[PDB]
Structure formats: C-alpha cells, structure tokens
Design an enzyme around this catalytic site. Structure first.
Site, mmCIF file in Angstrom:
data_model
loop_
_atom_site.group_PDB
_atom_site.id
_atom_site.type_symbol
_atom_site.label_atom_id
_atom_site.label_comp_id
_atom_site.label_asym_id
_atom_site.label_seq_id
_atom_site.Cartn_x
_atom_site.Cartn_y
_atom_site.Cartn_z
ATOM 1 N N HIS A 14 45.584 27.155 31.109
ATOM 2 C CA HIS A 14 46.475 26.491 32.046
ATOM 3 C C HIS A 14 46.313 26.957 33.489
ATOM 4 C CE1 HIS A 14 48.477 23.981 29.165
ATOM 5 N NE2 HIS A 14 48.443 25.000 28.326
ATOM 6 N N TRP A 84 55.578 25.510 31.648
ATOM 7 C CA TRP A 84 54.692 25.034 30.594
ATOM 8 C C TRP A 84 55.093 25.549 29.212
ATOM 9 C CZ3 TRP A 84 50.995 22.298 28.184
ATOM 10 C CH2 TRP A 84 50.388 21.272 28.926
ATOM 11 N N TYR A 130 36.364 8.121 32.035
ATOM 12 C CA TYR A 130 37.675 8.674 32.345
ATOM 13 C C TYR A 130 37.624 10.132 32.789
ATOM 14 C CZ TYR A 130 42.012 11.038 32.015
ATOM 15 O OH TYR A 130 43.028 11.894 32.379
ATOM 16 N N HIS A 167 44.768 17.689 20.997
ATOM 17 C CA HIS A 167 45.544 18.179 22.135
ATOM 18 C C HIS A 167 46.689 19.105 21.751
ATOM 19 C CE1 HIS A 167 44.169 14.959 25.262
ATOM 20 N NE2 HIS A 167 43.338 15.981 25.170
ATOM 21 N N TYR A 182 36.812 20.246 25.379
ATOM 22 C CA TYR A 182 36.251 19.732 26.626
ATOM 23 C C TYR A 182 34.984 20.501 26.976
ATOM 24 C CZ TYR A 182 40.873 17.654 27.303
ATOM 25 O OH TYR A 182 42.047 16.968 27.154
HETATM 26 O O1 LIG Z 1 44.852 15.301 28.092
HETATM 27 C C1 LIG Z 1 44.558 15.070 29.259
HETATM 28 N N1 LIG Z 1 44.822 15.810 30.316
HETATM 29 C C2 LIG Z 1 45.549 17.106 30.350
HETATM 30 C C3 LIG Z 1 45.707 17.708 31.571
HETATM 31 C C4 LIG Z 1 46.380 18.995 31.759
HETATM 32 C C5 LIG Z 1 46.985 19.278 33.015
HETATM 33 C C6 LIG Z 1 47.620 20.534 33.220
HETATM 34 C C7 LIG Z 1 47.651 21.507 32.177
HETATM 35 O O2 LIG Z 1 48.254 22.700 32.406
HETATM 36 C C8 LIG Z 1 47.054 21.229 30.924
HETATM 37 C C9 LIG Z 1 46.426 19.991 30.715
HETATM 38 N N2 LIG Z 1 45.146 17.035 32.790
HETATM 39 C C10 LIG Z 1 44.490 15.854 32.739
HETATM 40 C C11 LIG Z 1 43.969 15.281 34.051
HETATM 41 C C12 LIG Z 1 45.035 14.606 34.875
HETATM 42 C C13 LIG Z 1 46.098 15.363 35.485
HETATM 43 C C14 LIG Z 1 47.094 14.700 36.273
HETATM 44 C C15 LIG Z 1 47.045 13.279 36.466
HETATM 45 C C16 LIG Z 1 45.995 12.527 35.864
HETATM 46 C C17 LIG Z 1 44.991 13.187 35.069
HETATM 47 C C18 LIG Z 1 44.304 15.175 31.401
HETATM 48 N N3 LIG Z 1 43.685 14.015 31.164
HETATM 49 C C19 LIG Z 1 43.774 13.806 29.744
HETATM 50 C C20 LIG Z 1 44.570 12.491 29.427
HETATM 51 C C21 LIG Z 1 44.668 12.177 27.947
HETATM 52 C C22 LIG Z 1 45.937 12.282 27.294
HETATM 53 C C23 LIG Z 1 46.057 12.000 25.893
HETATM 54 C C24 LIG Z 1 44.897 11.610 25.142
HETATM 55 O O3 LIG Z 1 44.976 11.338 23.818
HETATM 56 C C25 LIG Z 1 43.623 11.500 25.783
HETATM 57 C C26 LIG Z 1 43.507 11.781 27.176
HETATM 58 O O4 LIG Z 1 42.390 13.674 29.291
HETATM 59 O O5 LIG Z 1 41.943 14.705 28.413
#
Ligand SMILES: O=C1N2C=C(c3ccc(O)cc3)N=C(Cc3ccccc3)C2=N[C@@]1(Cc1ccc(O)cc1)OO
Length: 187
Positions: A14, A84, A130, A167, A182
């Site tokens: 994070h 978080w 994406y 996730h 990732y």
């Molecule tokens: O999971 C995802 N993310 C997690 C974090 C993130 C951010 C902060 C943290 O502390 C931990 C994780 N940041 C981004 C990127 C993003 C951030 C803000 C606005 C738009 C995109 C992001 N994109 C995702 C979208 C996604 C969601 C569900 C799915 O099934 C597939 C794809 O793809 O994996």
C-alpha cells in the site's frame, strides 16, 4: 482469510500504491484526485459512456471513501494506511455476509467498460489497455503474469469473479497464492 496489518509487506504494498497515486509528490492525496483519475481513464482512454463512467465513479468514490478519504481533504500517508486497515476489515465483513464488497462493485463497473462484449470477462489485450492506461502496470510482461496467476492463458479471458477473489487476497489478506498478481509492478 484474515487481516495481516502488521505484515511489513502489507504496508509496503500500500505504500507503493500510495506513492503511485501521489503523482505530484505532495505527500497527500484527496478523493477529488482519485475520482478524477478514475473517470479520466475510462472516459479518455477506454471509451466509456457517461452512464458507464458514472457507475465507475460512484464505485471508486465508495472505495477510497472506505479508506477514509473525502472530498476537499488531503489524506497523508499515516491516515491513509490507518484508514486502509478499516477498509480492509469492512471489506472482509461484507465478504462474510456474501455482501458485495466495494472492490467487487468496482470490478463490475470497470469490466463493463473494458470488456468489449460487456460480459464480465476481458482479454489479455484489454487487461493491458486498462492497466497501462491507469499506470498500475507498465509492461506486457507483468500483465501476462496476472493471467498466469489467475490461471487463464493468453487467449482466454479474465473473469470478474476470479479477479475479485484474487484482489481479496492481494489487497486485503496477503494470501501467498496471490503473489505477483501484477507481476513485478506491485510489491
Ligand atoms: O484493483 C485495482 N486497483 C487497485 C488500486 C489500489 C489503490 C490503492 C491501494 O492502496 C491499493 C490498491 N488502484 C488502481 C488504480 C486506480 C486508482 C485510482 C483511480 C483509478 C485507478 C486499481 N485498478 C484496478 C481496478 C480493478 C478493480 C476490480 C477488478 O476486478 C479489476 C480491476 O485494477 O487492478
């Protein structure tokens, strides 16, 4: 299965994301920026409709709101990671009641935009489109790893149900089986 908040690697994952999100290196990020980034990506890079973008925004909004972020407020690192912990446990609680998690809601919104067929499954190329647009992944190599980990080959599709599961363990519980979701882009 369970929270692991004192796992330095959970904090590190994070911390990495926090730094990825703090583009201007202000040492703080706001919900305004998060929701801007979310909509900029789907509208300007993935060709989503206003309605699709709206659904995606509401989801992103709730997501970071769950971590304590708010409009017109700047969240620093300490508040961010503390917030978080709450997001993660709340997500776990929803999980327990088979209640749609915030991350689940996001995925559904995003996949409807990224999946050309609007079926909840995306191709490796769509995943690349994406991830590279958002910046969370930079190389095709790390995107393939995602499929390798989800158990879908370069020609099959990544399903939302499967990714959601990934996730939960990647972002919330530090499930060893989700390592490299990732590739090397995220610790
Ligand atoms: O999971 C995802 N993310 C997690 C974090 C993130 C951010 C902060 C943290 O502390 C931990 C994780 N940041 C981004 C990127 C993003 C951030 C803000 C606005 C738009 C995109 C992001 N994109 C995702 C979208 C996604 C969601 C569900 C799915 O099934 C597939 C794809 O793809 O994996």
């Amino acid at each position: 299965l369970t929270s692991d908040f004192d796992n330095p690697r959970w904090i590190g994952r994070h911390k990495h994301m926090f730094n990825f999100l703090d583009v201007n290196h202000n040492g703080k990020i706001s919900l305004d920026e998060m929701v801007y980034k979310a909509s900029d990506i789907v509208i300007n890079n993935l060709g989503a409709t206003p309605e699709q973008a709206k659904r995606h925004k509401d989801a992103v909004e709730a997501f970071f709101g769950g971590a304590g972020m708010k409009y017109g407020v700047e969240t620093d690192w300490p508040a961010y990671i503390e917030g978080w912990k709450k997001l993660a446990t709340d997500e776990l609680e929803k999980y327990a009641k088979n209640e749609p998690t915030l991350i689940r809601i996001w995925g559904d919104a995003l996949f409807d935009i990224v999946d050309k067929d609007q079926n909840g499954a995306i191709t490796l190329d769509e995943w690349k489109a994406y991830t590279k647009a958002a910046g969370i992944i930079q190389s095709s190599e790390d995107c393939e790893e995602t499929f390798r980990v989800c158990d879908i080959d370069e020609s099959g599709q990544l399903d939302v149900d499967e990714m959601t599961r990934q996730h939960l363990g990647f972002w919330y519980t530090m499930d060893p089986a989700c390592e490299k979701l990732y590739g090397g882009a995220v610790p």
